[PDB]
Design a protein around this ligand. Structure first.
Ligand SMILES: [Zn+2]
Lengths: 51, 469, 70, 48, 49, 272, 172, 53, 286
């Protein structure tokens, strides 16, 4: 019962995070910067996280 | 403590730089105070004194308050000694608090000095420190004049001075069951509007009712049902120490139900924490009950479970408690990790790897969480505090609510409960000193007959002896 | 408390909801979806939804703000 | 820019077209002057 | 002046007696509901709301 | 002295006033004041909130009419509220709780006014479905504030105000609600079930339709539950479909039937 | 004299605030407000209701109801705070005071300072004293001198406001 | 006073837009230059007779 | 007339705050304020209210302050912030009406032709419906009884706009009981329904006691409506009704049979798998 309660609570917590877009890179710009193409807007250069 | 002052300093040299100048650096000022408690060895504060300049406001207070635990039981020059160390309201307030810390549970004539020093205080931070030190020094005395002094101080209704007076007014009438004192305290609790006095009285109305057993039920059925959550937290503390020692059926049946059922998180946390003060007489049951509160959806229940496990086992290496804390120190929530670190420190004091096959691993775990440059500040606060507790008193002092004769050690229990209130107020951490009893054995038999004695240990597997190479 | 949690779970998927078009899933608790506003998003799927209904051209109602597929 | 309203010539009001965005009715700044602005004229405008 | 405009849009399938699909003008379509008092039988796909 | 982790207690009346005014203002940002007491350096109390007229200037210091504020304060003093005003709240519909560049300066003026006035941001369209996106801010003048307690990190900041400066130019202060037992179960009367609602017998035709649908769904669930139990062989050891769905179906069906039978029976024997 | 950290609350009172009731026309509120032999004496009977307002909210710590030793000094006083309206004698008889106080002869002397329940006086703006009785049970009660001790609560000027920095004039 | 309160509330921009048919339950419909349709419970500061689709 | 009035959380919280505000210092049997609302069809929706300076004499029941100018300019400013809300009705907290109240309602009628009064008994925290609504009536009574300026009951209920709904729910969250509450809440609701029915029937008892004993005037009305109520009881145990009741109860019984049997089957399926798993672990350990 506690397992289901906990998983529901954490799922509710992550459910607040938004849609995060969808992008496709055309060319990486070395560490961090990296160039990407998103569907409705144009090209951006977006730093990458800890991965 | 002085002659066996073997505290390690490389654990601080690789720590005072490892801290990124956050508020937890002031926590180090506490941690070392645990390690050198009663040893009067402030050389770490003299190895770098300008570093203390980066701990202004209440930290400086706490920093100065540190010296009080540093000179625990000095008693030979303290009144002039504190003035020599600290001749800024935080600073001399912490000096007054430290002076009380030196005279913990042993008032001497310092009470009277405090009794004239406090009345001239500026009704300020200075009064907060003075009231805390005075009440700690005059604990259990139940002297009427000091009690009415703290009555007047409490009736000043200031948030901070009232916070201190809440603890002091319970310390002075500790375990006295004084109906007048508790009546005034609760009447003020239901009448004030600043929550800091509520937090202080939450421990005060518990201190007044220490060890009274069933005599506290008349209180319990009042505080357990009062609508103010701080009052219910106070009721949890009262059922903790009034039923302290005995694993009384009614006490557990009450506080476990309150912890699992109540609507406010803080009362649940404190109710679960209160299990340690009532089950320490038989620590092996505590894992068996807390093993389910230990992993619950509610994180406050989790922190309370960690603290209760740490308190209940005292400094005895129950093994299973560490088995429960091992995943818990990796919990996503920061403050529950901090609580798990504190609990693990509380149990693994004075022990080596052969004595308990976890202590060195937990030492290097503290090492990695204290030097991580992006971990939670509360988690590394717990880490540095744990580093302080592990090597407390130069690896010579132990926390034990049980006295060696089987009697419940009241200074230790009151000190550890007030230390648990560091969640609300950091400077109270020094009260953990009241739980440190040295692990010495003395051969004195006549006047000053301390001769060299050839008694020996009998290590069967191998020699490990003193820790911390 | 589990009743409270599942009540909130039912609440998060209530009106108003913006319709979008389901794209192929990534993982058990997330997938890509293209909102009828035009834009596409990488969005967590509500665990209550039966996975078999997720045909790669399904119309799925999403949280208006968080775009969470509900 | 477009169609200087010029309803009273003490505050003239203008129309602007932000391409593929919108069409607004606006006024001059404290710096620019009515003689400096003509119809069309491809003017610039603040963002809020 | 205190009045606030309302977004116009054509409607689509009703899922239940309360939840409908409305194609807000040229913009995207949403899943919405009737307020409390409006009719329910008259709202058929192709009613300007 | 230097502030601390601090706290801000807002009352039930204040919260409802703020939410109602925000939902009235959307999509145009609206703002007003809260009355309260600087009870101490460690928490600020606000009780009651009054909105003020929406001028065309938008949320700004100029939007604060001095005449309206002064005479509202005088009439509230007459009516029994002498509460001196600290705190201003404004609405940000469509975006998270954070102080915009205008908001920074408005709160700078408000701080210059008293000293410790607190800004409040409410998003009336995101505060929905039982979640309220409320937050409160104060501006900094090295060390942002004194952390002398653990009740500062019991909450977690948000990325939106993080870039907009939730620690950069301003800092967020933990928000608490000072409801009391009298407001409790005074508000609850709103969803409180009536006794006739308790003894209501639902609708027998609709109840039969409900049982008809749920038993058929039970049959269709059990059909694949049979397959699931017939694949008990443990290839590639793997909560979707049959088991827990059957569980919830039996639970709801059984409780509905039991409660309907009990209500019908109680009505039969008690009502004549 | 005074306590430590407190100052006289007299500079914070308001002339528009003073509405002492039942006072003799010859001897008024200003008289008991002065540190002189000038005093207030009641007019109709021993009952005397005196209210005072403050420019800014003030925390009251203690009060000094000094009065003559002729038996006309105040004996039993009800203390009310932050009254919305003017207060009637019948209400004062029936209403529960913020503090019911019984002055002893030592309290009424020129050095007699009476402590107050400081917890209850933290946002006081208007105090009301309901002198109900005197020691000697004299027909009229005399108030030799009376002021309040405490501290201001650091209020602010609501309508002051004013723009300090920023865009100067127009923004979002 | 009312007129000045209206005056402070008629500040640019005005987001020019096209009018659509009127309804009674006197009230207007607007197609924005941003290509979105709005319905107004009240037409606003101008009179219904002057305006037209 | 007016068929219904719906009352939002905001007004009741405002009047609770007003009562605590006044009773804090100036404890009095009641406080009086003004409601703001709007009209749909012939139902009224009230969400706004402000306290007005008011005073009542203890026993003269004719002496009263309600501040004219304060009411007027407070309404004007509340219209400035929100112009939809116009003056409808006035509220007071006294659990009882007074002979003085109809004058208050007549004054309020100057600002609203059909002003409606609302009693909000804040102190009671009891069985239900803490709001009572009353309109002013003056008619010949059609039965030869002398006419009088009278208060007439109009049914009232609590309803919330969505923002007030999320606001109230968030504060109630900790003490909130679940809406579904499969068995526990439903059985408690039925028991509470029996409690409420018993309380109402006992109130009707006490009224009939006072009427037969004569200390309360015979309303002629309602009491004959009460007689219609008494003739409206269904009289179960009529045979075809018994047959239908048995049929429907048996349908419920077979349905609950199916559910219980499936529950037993799934229970056994969990049991067998648990035994298999633990026995597998035991066999592997050796
Ligand atoms: Zn803003």
């Amino acid at each position: 019962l506690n397992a289901k309660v906990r998983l529901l609570r954490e799922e509710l917590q992550l459910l607040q995070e938004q849609g995060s877009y969808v992008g496709e890179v055309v060319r990486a710009m070395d560490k961090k910067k990296v160039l990407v193409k998103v569907h409705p807007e144009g090209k951006f250069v977006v730093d990458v996280d800890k991965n | 403590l002085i002659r066996n002052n073997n505290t390690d300093l490389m654990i601080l040299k690789n720590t005072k730089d490892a801290v990124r100048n956050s508020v937890c650096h002031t926590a180090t000022v506490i941690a070392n105070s645990f390690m050198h408690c009663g040893t009067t060895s402030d050389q770490f504060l003299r190895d770098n004194l300008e570093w203390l300049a980066r701990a202004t406001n209440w930290a400086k207070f706490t920093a100065t308050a540190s010296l009080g635990v540093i000179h625990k039981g000095h008693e030979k020059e303290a009144l002039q000694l504190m003035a020599t160390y600290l001749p800024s309201a935080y600073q001399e307030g912490g000096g007054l608090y430290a002076l009380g810390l030196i005279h913990a549970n042993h008032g001497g004539d310092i009470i009277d000095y405090l009794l004239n020093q406090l009345k001239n205080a500026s009704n300020d931070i200075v009064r907060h420190g003075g009231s805390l030190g005075l009440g700690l020094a005059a604990m259990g005395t139940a002297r009427q004049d000091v009690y009415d002094l703290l009555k007047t101080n409490l009736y000043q209704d200031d948030a901070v001075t009232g916070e201190a007076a809440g603890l002091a007014l319970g310390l002075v009438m500790l375990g006295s069951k004084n109906a007048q004192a508790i009546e005034d305290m609760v009447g003020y609790a239901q009448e004030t509007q600043h929550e800091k006095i509520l937090r202080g009285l939450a421990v005060g109305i518990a201190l007044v009712m220490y060890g009274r057993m069933e005599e506290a039920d008349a209180l319990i059925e009042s505080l357990c049902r009062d609508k103010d959550p701080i009052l219910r937290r106070s009721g949890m503390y009262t059922v903790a120490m009034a039923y302290c020692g005995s694993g009384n059926n009614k006490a557990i049946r009450r506080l476990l139900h309150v912890a699992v059922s109540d609507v406010n998180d803080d009362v649940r946390r404190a109710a679960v924490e209160s299990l340690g003060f009532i089950l320490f007489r038989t620590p092996e049951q505590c894992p068996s009950v807390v093993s389910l509160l230990s992993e619950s959806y509610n994180p406050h229940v989790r922190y309370g479970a960690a603290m209760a496990l740490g308190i209940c086992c005292a400094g005895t290496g129950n093994k299973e408690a560490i088995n429960l804390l091992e995943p818990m120190t990796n919990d996503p929530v920061n403050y529950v990790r901090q609580g798990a670190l504190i609990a693990s420190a509380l149990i693994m004091i004075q022990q080596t790897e052969i004595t308990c096959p976890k202590v060195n691993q937990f030492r290097q775990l503290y090492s990695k969480v204290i030097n991580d440059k992006h971990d939670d500040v509360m988690a590394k606060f717990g880490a540095i505090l744990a580093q302080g507790i592990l090597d407390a008193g130069g690896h010579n002092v132990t926390i034990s609510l049980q006295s060696r004769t089987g009697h419940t050690h009241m200074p230790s229990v009151v000190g550890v409960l007030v230390f648990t209130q560091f969640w609300f107020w950091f400077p109270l951490s020094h009260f953990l000193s009241l739980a440190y009893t040295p692990t010495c054995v003395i051969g004195l038999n006549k006047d000053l007959k301390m001769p060299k004695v050839q008694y020996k240990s009998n290590c069967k597997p191998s020699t490990f002896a003193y820790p911390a190479p | 408390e589990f009743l409270h949690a599942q009540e909130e779970v039912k609440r998060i998927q209530s009106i108003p909801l913006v319709i979008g078009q389901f794209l192929e899933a990534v993982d058990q608790n997330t997938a890509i979806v293209g909102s009828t506003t035009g834009s596409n998003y990488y969005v967590r799927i509500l665990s209550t939804i039966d996975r078999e209904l997720l045909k790669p051209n399904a119309s799925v109602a999403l949280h208006k703000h968080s775009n969470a597929l509900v | 820019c477009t169609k200087i309203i010029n309803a009273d010539s003490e505050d003239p009001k203008y129309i602007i077209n932000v391409k593929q965005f919108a069409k607004f009715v606006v006024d001059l700044s404290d710096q620019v002057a009515p003689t400096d602005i003509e119809e069309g004229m491809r003017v610039g405008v603040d963002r809020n | 002046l205190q009045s606030v405009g309302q977004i116009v849009g054509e409607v689509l399938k009703q899922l239940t007696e309360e939840k409908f699909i409305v194609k807000a003008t040229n913009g995207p379509r949403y899943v919405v509901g009737c307020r409390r008092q409006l009719d329910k039988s008259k709202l058929k796909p192709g009613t300007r709301v | 002295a230097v502030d601390t982790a601090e706290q801000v207690y807002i009352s039930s009346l204040a919260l409802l006033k703020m939410l109602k005014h925000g939902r009235a203002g959307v999509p145009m940002e609206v703002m007003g004041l809260m009355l309260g007491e600087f009870v101490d350096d460690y928490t600020v109390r606000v009780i009651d909130v009054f909105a003020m007229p929406q001028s065309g200037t938008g949320v700004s210091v100029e939007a604060v009419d001095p005449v309206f504020q002064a005479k509202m304060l005088d009439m509230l003093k007459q009516t029994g509220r002498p509460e001196m005003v600290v705190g201003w709240y404004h609405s940000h519909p469509g975006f998270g709780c954070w102080l915009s560049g205008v908001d920074i300066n408005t709160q700078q003026s408000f701080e210059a006014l008293s000293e410790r006035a607190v800004a409040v941001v409410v998003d009336p369209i995101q505060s929905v479905k039982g979640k309220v996106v409320i937050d409160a801010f104060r501006l900094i003048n090295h060390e942002p504030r004194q952390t002398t307690s653990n009740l500062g990190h019991l909450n977690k900041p948000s990325i939106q105000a993080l870039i907009h400066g939730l620690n950069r130019h301003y800092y967020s202060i933990t928000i608490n609600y000072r409801k009391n037992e009298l407001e409790q179960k005074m508000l609850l009367n709103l969803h409180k079930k009536s006794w006739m609602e308790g003894l209501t017998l639902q609708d027998y035709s609709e109840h039969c339709k409900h049982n008809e649908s749920v038993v058929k769904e039970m049959l269709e669930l059990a059909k694949n539950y049979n397959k699931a139990v017939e694949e008990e062989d443990k290839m590639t050891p793997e909560k979707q479909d049959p088991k827990r769905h059957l569980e919830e179906h039996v639970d709801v069906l059984m409780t509905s039937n039991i409660v309907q039978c009990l209500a019908a029976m109680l009505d039969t024997v008690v009502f004549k | 004299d005074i306590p430590k950290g407190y100052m006289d609350l007299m500079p914070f009172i308001n002339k528009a605030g003073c509405e002492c009731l039942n006072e003799s026309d010859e001897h008024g509120f200003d008289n008991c407000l002065r540190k002189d032999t000038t005093f207030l004496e009641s007019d109709c009977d021993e009952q005397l209701l005196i209210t005072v307002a403050f420019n800014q909210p003030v925390k009251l710590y203690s009060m000094k109801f000094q009065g003559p030793d002729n038996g006309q000094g105040p004996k039993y006083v009800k203390i009310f705070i932050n009254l919305p309206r003017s207060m009637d004698f019948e209400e004062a008889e029936r209403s529960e005071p913020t503090q019911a106080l019984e002055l002893t002869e030592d309290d009424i002397k020129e050095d007699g300072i009476v402590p107050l329940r400081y917890v209850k006086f933290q946002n006081v703006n208007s105090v009301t004293i309901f002198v109900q009785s005197n020691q000697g049970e004299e027909e009229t009660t005399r108030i030799s001198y009376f002021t309040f001790i405490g501290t201001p609560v650091q209020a602010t000027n609501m309508n002051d406001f004013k723009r300090v920095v920023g865009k100067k004039g127009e923004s979002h | 006073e009312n007129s000045e309160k209206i005056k402070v509330n008629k500040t640019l921009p005005y987001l020019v837009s096209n009018v659509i048919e009127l309804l009674d339950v006197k009230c207007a419909v607007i197609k924005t230059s941003t290509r979105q349709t709005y319905f107004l419970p009240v037409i606003g500061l101008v009179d219904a007779e002057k305006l037209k689709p | 007339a007016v068929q219904k009035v719906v009352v939002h959380p905001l007004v009741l919280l405002s009047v609770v705050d007003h009562f605590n505000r006044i009773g804090k210092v100036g404890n009095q049997k009641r406080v009086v304020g003004v409601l703001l609302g709007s009209w749909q069809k012939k139902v009224l929706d009230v969400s706004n209210s402000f306290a007005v300076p008011f005073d009542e004499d203890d026993k003269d029941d004719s002496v009263w302050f309600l501040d004219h100018d304060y009411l007027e300019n407070m309404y004007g400013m509340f219209k400035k912030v929100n112009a939809r809300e116009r003056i409808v009705g006035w509220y007071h907290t006294g659990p009882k009406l007074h002979k003085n109240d109809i004058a208050i309602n007549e004054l309020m009628k100057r600002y609203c032709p059909n002003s409606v009064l609302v009693i909000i008994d804040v102190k009671p925290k009891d069985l239900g419906l803490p709001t009572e609504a009353y309109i002013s009536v003056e008619e010949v009574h059609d039965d030869g009884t002398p006419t009088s300026k009278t208060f007439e009951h109009v049914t009232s209920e609590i309803g919330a706009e969505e923002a007030e709904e999320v606001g109230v729910e968030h504060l109630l969250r900790d003490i909130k009981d679940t809406t579904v509450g499969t068995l526990s809440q439903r059985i408690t609701n039925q028991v509470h329904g029996l409690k409420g029915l018993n309380s109402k029937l006992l109130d009707i008892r006490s009224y009939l006691e006072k009427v037969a004993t004569g200390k309360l005037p015979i309303n002629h009305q309602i009491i004959y409506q009460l007689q219609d109520v008494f003739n409206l009881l269904p009289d179960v145990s009529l045979q075809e009704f018994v047959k239908a009741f048995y049929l429907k109860t048996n349908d419920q019984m077979v349905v609950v049979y199916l559910a219980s049997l499936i529950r037993s089957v799934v229970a056994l399926h969990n049991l067998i798998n648990n035994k298999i798993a633990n026995r597998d672990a035991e066999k592997k350990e050796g």
